[PDB]
Write a protein that binds this ligand. Structure first.
Ligand SMILES: CCCCCCCCCCCCCCCCC[C@@H](O)O[C@H](CO[C@H](O)CCCCCCCCCCCCCCC)COP(=O)(O)OCC[N+](C)(C)C
Ligand SMILES: NC(=O)C1=CN([C@@H]2O[C@H](COP(=O)(O)OP(=O)(O)OC[C@H]3O[C@@H](n4cnc5c(N)ncnc54)[C@H](OP(=O)(O)O)[C@@H]3O)[C@@H](O)[C@H]2O)C=CC1
Ligand SMILES: CCCCCCCCCCCCCC(=O)SCCNC(=O)CCNC(=O)[C@@H](O)C(C)(C)COP(=O)(O)O
Ligand code: SF4
Ligand code: SF4
Lengths: 176, 109, 208, 337, 18, 112, 44, 94
C-alpha cells in the first residue's frame, strides 16, 4: 500500500553525471516547461462568450424563488407554514388568515434573499409543492430593500417563468 | 454567595432591572403527553418588542429574551441564579393529584 | 434486523472493556469509572486535580501510547455542583484506537493546563479560556482568540444570548465604527420543537 | 406615529424629517443624529447619486429615502414634502452659481418651501440664516437670506429659524479655508487685530441642537441662534490656527480695496473658486453678540469648546514632521470676553 | 412594503359635545 | 479548595494598585501613539472610573481573577493590539442619553 | 372553475399526478363540495 | 483544429494532446434523458414488515460500564497490533 514518493536517488554513473551537469548548465527541464506553455498557447481557448452565450446548468439547479399557480389559475400556497419551520436561515415569514371563501391562505408571505442561503429546503418541504426554487439565477440589484421579496413579488416571478419551472420539475420529479 | 457579576460581561441593566422566573413547564393542554412537562427551567421576563416600520417584522431590543435553561432540581436552579446574583420567582412543582377510576361506577344504577 | 441497523462488533467491545479494567487496576488513585459507550468508545473519568498525572501516563507506554490530543472539548451544563465539563480525546497509533478521558470543573477553581503532557494543546488552552470562564494553571499564555478585542463575556456559557449584548456600526459624525447594544431586527424567532411522549424507554431516568 | 422601543438604530420615531441639500457639511451630522435615533429621513438629491452615496449607511434598511427634485419647479418640491411630517431647510451657498442666481437661492426656494409647507399641512418647518443676516451693505448673502428669512416668517410664521454662530468641524468650509490660506503664502488681514472678531460653535453642537429643537415643544416660531461658549479675536484666532497646524505664520496686512481686487480676480474660475468677493465680505464683518434671542442653551445643550476640538479638524494640514501631537501642547487661546 | 393591514384599530373620542 | 492567586483580600488589592500604576503611566503613551484626541486627563479619569466599577467586589479568588482579566487589556494596548476604535469604545460617546429618573424614563418608553 | 359532477365520494389531487395537492376524497354529489386547495368542487 | 498547427503543438508538448484534447468537451453526454423509474427499496414488502424489528434507534442502549469506582493477572493490549503495510507492489517507488 504505502508508497515512497522520492526516496529514489540519482546514479553516480559518469554518463548520468555529465547529463545532470549539462542539465544544470543548459536548463533542460526549464526549456521543457517553457515548451509546455508554448504548447498550451495553441489549444482553443475555453472561454464562453457571456452574455451572448451562457454556461451549462442542470434541471436540479437552485436560484430565485417563486410561488406558483394551479393551471386553474388558483395559487397553490396553503400556509402550512412549515417553510418557515424548516428554513435554517429562517428567512421566511408567514402570516396566514382565512379566505372569505374559508380556504386557508397567506396574507403576507415574504422572504428575504439577504438571509436566504439557497439551500433548497423549502423546495423539498412543501407538501403542495407551492414554493419552488426557480431556474433563474440572476437578479442582482441596486438596493437592499428590493431583496426583501413580498408575496406579490414571488407571484410575479411565478408568472414570469411558469413554463420554465414546470419544465424543470417535469424533467426532475421522478428522481425525487 | 458566590457572586460572579463582574466576571460575566453582562451589562448591569439585565442582572438588575429584570427577573428570572423558575418553573416546571405546564403540559400543553392540547397534548395528552407528559414528557416535556418535567424538569425545571429558567425563563426570563418579557420586555418590549415592537414592529419593523418596513415589512412589519417584530423588531426587538432586549438582549436575551429567548434564553431558557433546563434543570434536574429546583434547589440547584435557585442556587444557580444566586451564583449569578439573579432576582428570581420560584414556583412550585404542581403534580396532579392521583385520582380514582372505575369503569363499573358508571353502572351503579 | 440486518439491512438497516449497524452490526456492532462484540470483539472491540471486549477489548476496550478489558483494557478499561486494565487501566482501572493499573492506576486507580483517580479513575472514577471506565464506561464503554456501546458503539466502541471507551471513556474513563478523572478527578480534576488528577489531570496531568493521568494523561502523562496516557502517553507513557504500557499500551497507552495514546499520542496526540485530537481535541480539548469543553461541554457546558448549567446544573451540577460544577458546571463546566472538560473532555480529552486521544489516539494510539500502533494499536490504532481512541479513548476519551474527562473531568469536571468549578466556575472558579483553576485546573492546571495540560499542554506539556499531550504537547499540541497550547491553542486549546486559549480557546476554552475565551469560550468559557475556566482557567488552566501552568499555562504559558492564555489570551483571547475567536473573539473581538474587548467583548468580555465568554460565549458558549450555555446561557448568554447568541445575539450577544453588542454590535459594531460605522458612524460618520465621529467617522469611526463603534459598539452599541443590539437593537436587533426581526428577532430570533424561537421555535419550541421539543415534544411530549418519551421516545426512549431504553433510557429515561427514574422518576425519583 | 407614536415612537417605540429604546432609541436606537432599529428604533422608530415619528420624525419623517426632510432635509434639503444635505450633501453639504450640514446636515450630514444632523441626519446622523436622526439615524442613531433610528428616525426616518427623506433626504432628496439635486446633484448626483454618487456624492450622496455615503449617506446610505446612516439609515437602517428602509429608513433613508433619496428623492429626485428641483428647487425651481413648484411640484418638484411638492414631491419630497408630500408625506413629510417636518421639513427642514439647510440649503446655503457661498459663491453664487450662474443658473442659480444668488437671490433665488435665499428667496424663491425657501418661499415655495414655506407655502407648500402650508398646503401639505406640514407639522413643522425650520430654516437657517447667518447671525449677520440682519441687513448690511456688505455682502448680498446676509441680505438675501434676510429676505427669505422674513419671507418664510411671512409665509410659515410658526417656523423656528436657525441663526448659527459659525460652526467648526472636520468637514468645515471655514476653518479649513483659513488653514489653507497658507498655500498662497501669508494670511491676508485687512488690518490685523480687532478689525473683526468671531465666536464659534462645534458642528456637533449645532446638529444636536437642531434635533433637540424638534425635541422641544417650546421651539415653535422662536428664532434660534447658536453661539459657542468662548469669545475670540480673529488675529489671535488665526494665530491659534497655525498654532495647531504648525505651519509658518505670516500676518499679511492689506489695504481693504486690494483684497476685493483679489476676490474679483478669483471669481473668474469656472469651477468652484477658493475665494469670492461675497466671501471677502464674509471675512471682515464681526458677529453680533446678542444673546437675548432664543438659542442653543435654551435647548439645554451646552456648547463644546472649540479649543479641544480644532486639532482633529486640522491634523490633515499638518506636515509629517508634526503630524502626531497632543492638542494640549498648543496652549489654550486667551478669551477676549 | 408593509403587508397585512393594521393592528389595534384604537377607538377615538366622539365629535359630539358631552 | 485551591486558590487562584493571592490568599485573602488586600494581598490582591496591591496587585490592582500595581495595575493602576501601569495603566496610568501608560495612558499618555496611548493617547500619543494612537493619535487619540481624548483629553489626556479624560482617559486617566475614565481609568479611575473603571477601577471604581468593581470597587465593591469582596470574594477571595474573584478579585485576582479580575486582575487576570485586567492584565490582558493593557497587554493589548501596549502591543498596539486593539485600535483607535477598539480603545475609544469605552467612552460610549455615540449613545443617546438615558436619564435614570423615573418620570423621565416614564415619558419615553414602555420601560421594564 | 365549474364544479365536476359526482355521486358521491370521489378523489381530488389538483390534477397533478405526484404534482398536485396530496390526494383527498371529497364527498358530495348534488351538494356543493370540498375542498383541499384545488377548488375542484363537486356541486353536481 | 488544423493539421498545420496540431503537429507542431504536440511536438512542443511532448505529450501529443490530440488523443485527448481534454481542454474542451466536443461531444459528451446528451442532456435530455429517458425517465428514471428508479429502485423500490428493501423494506417495501407489505407481507412481513414490523418496525419493532427494522428499527435501529430503539436498539440504542445505555453505555456498558465498568468499575463505577464511585459506588498472576496478565497484561493486555487495547487491540492486537496492526501489521506493517506491504509496499505498493506494482509501483514500489515514485
Ligand atoms: C572553447 C570553450 C569555450 C567555452 C565552452 C563551454 C561553455 C561553458 C558552459 C556554458 C554554460 C553557460 C550557461 C549559463 C550559466 C548557467 C548556470 C545557471 O543555470 O545557474 C543555475 C540557476 O539557473 C538559472 O537561474 C535558471 C533561471 C533562468 C530563467 C530563464 C529561463 C531561460 C529560458 C531559455 C532562454 C534561452 C534563450 C537563448 C538561447 C540561445 C544555478 O545552478 P544551481 O544553483 O546549482 O541549481 C539550479 C540548476 N537549474 C539551472 C536547473 C535551475
Ligand atoms: N459654519 C457654517 O457653515 C454655517 C452655515 N450656516 C447656514 O446653514 C446651512 C448649512 O451649511 P452647510 O451645509 O455647511 O452648507 P453646504 O453648502 O455644505 O450645504 C448646502 C447643500 O445644499 C445644496 N443645495 C442648496 N440649494 C441648492 C440648489 N438650488 N441646487 C442644488 N443644490 C443645492 C448644496 O449643493 P448640492 O446639495 O447640490 O451638492 C449643498 O449640498 C447653510 O445654508 C449656511 O448658510 C449658518 C451658520 C454657520
Ligand atoms: C484610556 C481609557 C481606556 C482604559 C480605561 C481604564 C482601563 C481599566 C480597565 C479596568 C480593569 C479593572 O478595573 S480590574 C479590577 C479593579 N479592582 C477594583 O475595582 C477593586 C475595588 N475594591 C476596592 O477596595 C477599591 O476601592 C480599591 C481602590 C482597590 C481600594 O484600594 P485599597 O486601599 O488597596
Ligand atoms: S409549504 Fe409552500 S405552501 Fe405549504 S405553507 Fe410553506 S410555503 Fe405555503
Ligand atoms: S432557500 Fe434554502 S434556505 Fe432560504 S428558505 Fe428556501 S430553503 Fe430555507
Amino acid at each position: 500500500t504505502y508508497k515512497f514518493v522520492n526516496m529514489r536517488e540519482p546514479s553516480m554513473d559518469m554518463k548520468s553525471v555529465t547529463d545532470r551537469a549539462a542539465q544544470t548548465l543548459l536548463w533542460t527541464e526549464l526549456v521543457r516547461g517553457l515548451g509546455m506553455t508554448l504548447s498550451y498557447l495553441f489549444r482553443e481557448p475555453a472561454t464562453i462568450n457571456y452574455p451572448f452565450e451562457k454556461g451549462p446548468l442542470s434541471p436540479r439547479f437552485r436560484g430565485e424563488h417563486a410561488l406558483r399557480r394551479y393551471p386553474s389559475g388558483e395559487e397553490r400556497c396553503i400556509a402550512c407554514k412549515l417553510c418557515e419551520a424548516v428554513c435554517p436561515a429562517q428567512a421566511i415569514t408567514i402570516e396566514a388568515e382565512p379566505r372569505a371563501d374559508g380556504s386557508r391562505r397567506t396574507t403576507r408571505y415574504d422572504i428575504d434573499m439577504t438571509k436566504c442561503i439557497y439551500c433548497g429546503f423549502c423546495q423539498e418541504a412543501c407538501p403542495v409543492d407551492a414554493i419552488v426554487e426557480g431556474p433563474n439565477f440572476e437578479f442582482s440589484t441596486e438596493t437592499h430593500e428590493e431583496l426583501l421579496y413580498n408575496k406579490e413579488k414571488l407571484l410575479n416571478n411565478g408568472d414570469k417563468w411558469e413554463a420554465e419551472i414546470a419544465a424543470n420539475i417535469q424533467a426532475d420529479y421522478l428522481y425525487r | 454567595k458566590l457572586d460572579i457579576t463582574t466576571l460575566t460581561g453582562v451589562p448591569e441593566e439585565h442582572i438588575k432591572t429584570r427577573k428570572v422566573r423558575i418553573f416546571v413547564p405546564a403540559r400543553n393542554n392540547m397534548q395528552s403527553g407528559v414528557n416535556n412537562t418535567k424538569k425545571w427551567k429558567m425563563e426570563f421576563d418579557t420586555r418590549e418588542r415592537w414592529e419593523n416600520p418596513l415589512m412589519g417584522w417584530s423588531s426587538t431590543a432586549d438582549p436575551l429574551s429567548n434564553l431558557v435553561l433546563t434543570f434536574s432540581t429546583k434547589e440547584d436552579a435557585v442556587a444557580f441564579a444566586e451564583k449569578n446574583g439573579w432576582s428570581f420567582d420560584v414556583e412550585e412543582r404542581k403534580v396532579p393529584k392521583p385520582k380514582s377510576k372505575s369503569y363499573g361506577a358508571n353502572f351503579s344504577w | 434486523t440486518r439491512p438497516t441497523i449497524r452490526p456492532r462488533n462484540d470483539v472491540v467491545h471486549k477489548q476496550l472493556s478489558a483494557f478499561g479494567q486494565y487501566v482501572a487496576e493499573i492506576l486507580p488513585k483517580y479513575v472514577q469509572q471506565v464506561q464503554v459507550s456501546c458503539f466502541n468508545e471507551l471513556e474513563i473519568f478523572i478527578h480534576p486535580d488528577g489531570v496531568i498525572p493521568v494523561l502523562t501516563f496516557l502517553r507513557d507506554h504500557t499500551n497507552a501510547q495514546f499520542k496526540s490530543l485530537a481535541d480539548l472539548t469543553a461541554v457546558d451544563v448549567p446544573t451540577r455542583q460544577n458546571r463546566f465539563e472538560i473532555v480529552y480525546n486521544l489516539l494510539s497509533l500502533r494499536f490504532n484506537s481512541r479513548i476519551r478521558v474527562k473531568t469536571y470543573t468549578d466556575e472558579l477553581t483553576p485546573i492546571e493546563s495540560s499542554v506539556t503532557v499531550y504537547k499540541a494543546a497550547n491553542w486549546y488552552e486559549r480557546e476554552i479560556w475565551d469560550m468559557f470562564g475556566v482557567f488552566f494553571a501552568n499555562h504559558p499564555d492564555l489570551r483571547r482568540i475567536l473573539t473581538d478585542y474587548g467583548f468580555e463575556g465568554h460565549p458558549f456559557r450555555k446561557d448568554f444570548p447568541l445575539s450577544g449584548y453588542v454590535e459594531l456600526r460605522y458612524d460618520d459624525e465621529v467617522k469611526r465604527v463603534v459598539a452599541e447594544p443590539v437593537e436587533l431586527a426581526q428577532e430570533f424567532r424561537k421555535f419550541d420543537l421539543n415534544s411530549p411522549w418519551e421516545a426512549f424507554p431504553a433510557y429515561r431516568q427514574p422518576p425519583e | 406615529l407614536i415612537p417605540h422601543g429604546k432609541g436606537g438604530r432599529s428604533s422608530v420615531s415619528g420624525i419623517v424629517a426632510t432635509v434639503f441639500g444635505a450633501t453639504g457639511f450640514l446636515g450630514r451630522y444632523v441626519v446622523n443624529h436622526l439615524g442613531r435615533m433610528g428616525s426616518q429621513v427623506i433626504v432628496p438629491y439635486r446633484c448626483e447619486p454618487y456624492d450622496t452615496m455615503h449617506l446610505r449607511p446612516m439609515g437602517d434598511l428602509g429608513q433613508i429615502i433619496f428623492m429626485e427634485w428641483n428647487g425651481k419647479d413648484k411640484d418638484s418640491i411638492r414631491k419630497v414634502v408630500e408625506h413629510s411630517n417636518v421639513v427642514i431647510n439647510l440649503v446655503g451657498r457661498e459663491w453664487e452659481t450662474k443658473n442659480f442666481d444668488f437671490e433665488d437661492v435665499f428667496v424663491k426656494i425657501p418661499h415655495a418651501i414655506a407655502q407648500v409647507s402650508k398646503e401639505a399641512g406640514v407639522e413643522k418647518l425650520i430654516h437657517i440664516s447667518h447671525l449677520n443676516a440682519d441687513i448690511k451693505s456688505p455682502s448680498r448673502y446676509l441680505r438675501s437670506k434676510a429676505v427669505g428669512e422674513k419671507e418664510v416668517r411671512a409665509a410659515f410664521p410658526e417656523a423656528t429659524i436657525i441663526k448659527p454662530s459659525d460652526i467648526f468641524g472636520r468637514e468645515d468650509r471655514f476653518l479649513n479655508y483659513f488653514a489653507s490660506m497658507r498655500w498662497f503664502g501669508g494670511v491676508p488681514l485687512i488690518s490685523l487685530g480687532k478689525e473683526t472678531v468671531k465666536q464659534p460653535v462645534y458642528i456637533v453642537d449645532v446638529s444636536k441642537g437642531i434635533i433637540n429643537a424638534i425635541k422641544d415643544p417650546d421651539a415653535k416660531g422662536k428664532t434660534f441662534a447658536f453661539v459657542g461658549p468662548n469669545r475670540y479675536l480673529l488675529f489671535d484666532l488665526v494665530q491659534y490656527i497655525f498654532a495647531v497646524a504648525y505651519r509658518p505664520f505670516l500676518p499679511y496686512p492689506l489695504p481693504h480695496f486690494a483684497y476685493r481686487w483679489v476676490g474679483r480676480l478669483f471669481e473668474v474660475s469656472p469651477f468652484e473658486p477658493w475665494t469670492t468677493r461675497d466671501k471677502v465680505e464674509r471675512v471682515h464683518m464681526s458677529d453680533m453678540t446678542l444673546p437675548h434671542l432664543p438659542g442653543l442653551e435654551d435647548l439645554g445643550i451646552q456648547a463644546t469648546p472649540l479649543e479641544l476640538k480644532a486639532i482633529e479638524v486640522l491634523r490633515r494640514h499638518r506636515t509629517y514632521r508634526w503630524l502626531t501631537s497632543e492638542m494640549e501642547d498648543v496652549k489654550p487661546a486667551k478669551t477676549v470676553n | 412594503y408593509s403587508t397585512t393591514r393594521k393592528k389595534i384599530q384604537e377607538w377615538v373620542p366622539p365629535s359630539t359635545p358631552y | 479548595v485551591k486558590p487562584i492567586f493571592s490568599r485573602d483580600m488586600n494581598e490582591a488589592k496591591r496587585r490592582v494598585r500595581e495595575l493602576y500604576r501601569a495603566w496610568y503611566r501608560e495612558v499618555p503613551n496611548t493617547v500619543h501613539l494612537f493619535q487619540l484626541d481624548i483629553s489626556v486627563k479624560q482617559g486617566r479619569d475614565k481609568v479611575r472610573e473603571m477601577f471604581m466599577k468593581n470597587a465593591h467586589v469582596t470574594d477571595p479568588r474573584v478579585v485576582d481573577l479580575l486582575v487576570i482579566k485586567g492584565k490582558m487589556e493593557l497587554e493589548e494596548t501596549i502591543n498596539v493590539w486593539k485600535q483607535r476604535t477598539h480603545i475609544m469604545r469605552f467612552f460610549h460617546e455615540t449613545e443617546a442619553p438615558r436619564p435614570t429618573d423615573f418620570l423621565s424614563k416614564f415619558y419615553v418608553g414602555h420601560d421594564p | 372553475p365549474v364544479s365536476e359532477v359526482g355521486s358521491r365520494v370521489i378523489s381530488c389531487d389538483g390534477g397533478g399526478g405526484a404534482l398536485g395537492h396530496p390526494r383527498v376524497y371529497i364527498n358530495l354529489d348534488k351538494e356543493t363540495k370540498t375542498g383541499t386547495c384545488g377548488y375542484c368542487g363537486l356541486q353536481f | 483544429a488544423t493539421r498545420v498547427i496540431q503537429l507542431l503543438r504536440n511536438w512542443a508538448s511532448g505529450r501529443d494532446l490530440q488523443a485527448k484534447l481534454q481542454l474542451r468537451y466536443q461531444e459528451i453526454s446528451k442532456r435530455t434523458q429517458p425517465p428514471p423509474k428508479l429502485p423500490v427499496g428493501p423494506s417495501h414488502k407489505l407481507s412481513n414488515n414490523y418496525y419493532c424489528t427494522r428499527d435501529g434507534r430503539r436498539e440504542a442502549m445505555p453505555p456498558s460500564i465498568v468499575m463505577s469506582s464511585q459506588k498472576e493477572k496478565k497484561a493486555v493490549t487495547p487491540a492486537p497490533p496492526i501489521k506493517r503495510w506491504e509496499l505498493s507492489k506494482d509501483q514500489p517507488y515514485l
